[PDB]
Amino acid sequence: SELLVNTKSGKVMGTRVPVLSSHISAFLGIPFAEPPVGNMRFRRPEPKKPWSGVWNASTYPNNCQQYVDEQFPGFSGSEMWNPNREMSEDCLYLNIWVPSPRPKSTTVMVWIYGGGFYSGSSTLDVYNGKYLAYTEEVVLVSLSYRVGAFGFLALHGSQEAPGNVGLLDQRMALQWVHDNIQFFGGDPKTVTIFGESAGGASVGMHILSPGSRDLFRRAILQSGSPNCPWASVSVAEGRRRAVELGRNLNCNLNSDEELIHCLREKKPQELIDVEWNVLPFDSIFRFSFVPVIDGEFFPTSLESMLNSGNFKKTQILLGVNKDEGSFFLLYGAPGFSKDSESKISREDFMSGVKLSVPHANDLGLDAVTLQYTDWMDDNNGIKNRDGLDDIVGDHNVICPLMHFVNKYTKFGNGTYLYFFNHRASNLVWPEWMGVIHGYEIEFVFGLPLVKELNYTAEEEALSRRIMHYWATFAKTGNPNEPHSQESKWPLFTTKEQKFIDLNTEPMKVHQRLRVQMCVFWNQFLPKLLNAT
Amino acid sequence: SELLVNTKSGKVMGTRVPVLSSHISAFLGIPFAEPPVGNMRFRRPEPKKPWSGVWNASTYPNNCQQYVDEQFPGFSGSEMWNPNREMSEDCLYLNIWVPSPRPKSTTVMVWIYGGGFYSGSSTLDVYNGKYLAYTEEVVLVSLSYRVGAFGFLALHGSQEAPGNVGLLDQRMALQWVHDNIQFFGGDPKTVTIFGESAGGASVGMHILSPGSRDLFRRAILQSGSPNCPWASVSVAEGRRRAVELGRNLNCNLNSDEELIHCLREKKPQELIDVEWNVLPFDSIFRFSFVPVIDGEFFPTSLESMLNSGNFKKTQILLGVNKDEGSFFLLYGAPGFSKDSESKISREDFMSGVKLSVPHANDLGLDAVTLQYTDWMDDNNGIKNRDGLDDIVGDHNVICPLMHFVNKYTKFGNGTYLYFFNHRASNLVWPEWMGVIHGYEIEFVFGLPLVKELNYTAEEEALSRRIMHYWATFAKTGNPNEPHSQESKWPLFTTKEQKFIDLNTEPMKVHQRLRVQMCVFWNQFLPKLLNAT
Ligand SMILES: *[C@@H]1O[C@H](CO)[C@@H](O[C@@H]2O[C@H](CO)[C@@H](O)[C@H](O)[C@H]2NC(C)=O)[C@H](O)[C@H]1NC(C)=O
Ligand SMILES: *[C@@H]1O[C@H](CO[C@@H]2O[C@@H](C)[C@@H](O)[C@@H](O)[C@@H]2O)[C@@H](O)[C@H](O)[C@H]1NC(C)=O
Ligand SMILES: *[P@](C)(=O)O[C@H](C)C(C)(C)C
Ligand SMILES: *[P@](C)(=O)O[C@H](C)C(C)(C)C
Ligand SMILES: [Cl-]
Ligand SMILES: [Cl-]
């Protein structure tokens, strides 16, 4: 039986799923760790104990416990990111889509979901692996990992809540893929990890962490990089926020043991309800429980690792969307709303700048304002709105990614950079938001191939082009088909810094992505802040 | 006799001078102070004692003792600025051009020469007042004043070398004009002071100083403003440089009395030979002996005077040239030379930035570099050369002037702003230097009306247009002829910030002159430097 697979953990039975007038096999909700429940809350994951009989892998698993977005009830633009299954702390499962007939030793791609480390689900419609697995003939895996305090509460020095456990959940799923994917017809020596936003940061973190490097071959990072300002905190800051969470829940704070015990007694929703209260600043694009620079998962600071070439040397493919900032401004900044053009007054610009760079002193804020204000036309509401989008996008996504790409490329074995700038014809969000954080994912996963979803012909073609770049890259370390006539995606090099756009128009090659602003964010501002 | 005038100081006999197929009267070398020689060196000027008989005013006076430019011997571009008469400490004289027949009560314009407070002469060919006096029917006066240490050595607290004596020379010439110009047919109630570079700064300083305000009606400032970073120093810095001059000349430094006595024994050239050695920094566009913020000539800081409206409220006309920086880069910065295109390497750019902003710390230098580097094309030699021109021009001339105009306009009675951007067809300097510091002067003084000087027809027309703006402004407080059909030079207002270009093409109105860079120079950089 094509739907029966024996693994080192036991037998699993999958399900035949229709896809684009054909079918493939899906193995959904396979456990890769023991349920991290009770006294196991906050602890490192434990390998799943093997089972007897046949694991029923016909249905999606529970999602991890998380904050749920209720800002626009019933609206598909926001609800498409929310858990679509029951939430449980029992949530460490993976999903595999397998071509039919079962392959022998094919390329494997492992998806790591984003969600700012506070949310996310492997089960979202937008992460349905069937289209990519079917079209490009890869074994497509999606893993899961604990988010929020359950994944990232960090009391450094404790073994009960050491931090980074969600990253260790991801590593354990990669370990399981390494050990077992061959039985599904996957080649464990040709595994590509790929992820978006926090999943992109996570991919970079596995590139860096000595304990993860050997578990995959190559990597794709979408709108995320390990050095993003929101993606990690120090052990002191992690400790502070954990104690502040305890304070919100009226915990005994006299020791780590007392705090952890109190926190373990709470219902999951109790933690989630006060999660946002522990942030040190009035901010946007900052999240409470995130990876911690611990000296173990990350042996030294991210900057010193990148500078010294202390990371996995392989090929990477990565890039960003045109309007990375707009999502967070909409949700978090005055003057921005879903149902208006959100033209921004000078005053709301200033408020926005302060929320966007919460760690800056007044001089730093002046620097940012000067860098992004057109002083020939400073009361232009469109320019102010677009300026803020750029500030938030450049600071949180594009410039950290550019800093990563330039550091990585000095030691790596091949870099391909993209700029995704296609606004989908059927987008439900307002026009002012442009090409939003997260909205390339639907193209990467082939949703535009589905008739009922109402994409244009050109959008289907773009999706096929992207799926083929991603999968060819996963296969070979190069997104370009050898000896094809199509226009080539050039290698990013230190010297020429080339990248391509990704849209429905003929591909163009560009150079030096947002270089002017990234010198400001990567070199000048940090120096200014360190001096003053 | 038209050439004989009786004044309160005694009788003067002038000379009939040919001008443009006609003639006018010139009274050259009239004394307005006692010779500031011997024990009077460094002291405030004394009014000239009246004389018996007839003062022979047929020939140009001596020039004040100054550093003489020998960088390009025999080259007209540089030598046109050098003294063209014998140098003497006996140099406090003025020149008057008077229409023929002698007017009754006509508009008076008083020219104050530039030269960075270290040089300058009233007698330069380029300051020949005959063309303007003849064409526009004004009484044209040019004054003189002590420069270098002779005018500006400052030992605050001493009455023997108090500082600012060159500004007091200028005021005494204005006093003489006030008291005597009526006899030459001038109206002492309608005197316009005008000057370029240090002369423009000086004009602004007379606007500010309570002791000067009553001596003139209105004012024109060309490429200079009183708040320019090179135009004044503190009393502490003036003292330091005076003592350092003494050190260079092996003076007794035990007291002001000992230092001044030593300095008074020296031949003028002895002072001049070591003048440049007292500067505190490795710099360009900085001069050794300049006006001092003394609490007397200037009652408080220039910034507090400007902020509180502590200045003469009247009409002003002022502006700048396109390439204010190039002169000083040519003379003072590596990579720049007279006979090459002076394309600038990244390395010479950095050296240039450091010379241009000598008071900045390393962070400030980084700020300037970031503000003026095109990071998409950073090795472009033309862009680097042009970037440096802008840095030097914006920092030293344009941005201080813009700061002055905006402060002044809040309290004043009418502001007219220009941007002179015509490159003269017969310019002897290289093309890379563009529209140079000082090169509007020849247009203001009507040299393009002289056939033998080889200007184009369009340049003559531009000169006539400029002379007419300047003189109509001097007459009425408005450069525009009432009820003429020509296009109007609009008033500069706080709200609309309009200015005109001045070139051979039809006049255009623009707004917000170099506003982006001037926020950097006037607001951000000073804040950065004060914090770090
Ligand atoms: C310059 O000052 C004059 C006189 O103070 C101003 O003219 C006066 O303006 C007020 C307000 O419009 C009138 O009520 C007076 O009748 C005006 N007086 C005269 C004599 O005209 C003038 O507005 C000022 N100009 C600028 C550009 O500030
Ligand atoms: C007035 O001066 C005229 C020009 O004088 C010249 O310069 C002075 C400084 C002397 O050096 C003199 O020898 C030069 O000729 C004379 O042409 C003119 O005669 C003088 N007039 C009177 C009445 O003295
Ligand atoms: P990043 C901040 O993890 O973002 C998520 C995936 C999204 C829902 C697209 C904003
Ligand atoms: P400013 C620095 O006083 O400049 C003089 C007049 C010139 C010779 C034009 C550079
Ligand atoms: Cl947009
Ligand atoms: Cl030029």
From Swiss-Prot, chains A, B:
Gene3D superfamilies: alpha/beta hydrolase. Keywords: Cell membrane, Disulfide bond, Glycoprotein, GPI-anchor, Hydrolase, Lipoprotein, Membrane, Neurotransmitter degradation, Serine esterase, Signal, Synapse. PROSITE patterns: CARBOXYLESTERASE_B_1 (PS00122), CARBOXYLESTERASE_B_2 (PS00941). Disulfide bonds join C64-C91, C251-C262, C399-C518. Inhibited by substrate concentrations above 0.5 mM. One of its GO terms (biological process) is acetylcholine catabolic process in synaptic cleft. Glycans are attached at N56, N413, N454, N530. It catalyses: acetylcholine + H2O = choline + acetate + H(+). An interchain disulfide bond is present in what becomes position 593 of the T isoform. GO terms for cellular component: extracellular space; plasma membrane; side of membrane; synapse; synaptic cleft. GO terms for molecular function: acetylcholinesterase activity. Pfam families: COesterase. It is an enzyme of class 3 (hydrolase). Isoform H form is a homodimer; the asymmetric form is a disulfide-bonded oligomer composed of a collagenic subunit (Q) and a variable number of T catalytic subunits. Terminates signal transduction at the neuromuscular junction by rapid hydrolysis of the acetylcholine released into the synaptic cleft. May be involved in cell-cell interactions. This is Acetylcholinesterase. It comes from Tetronarce californica.
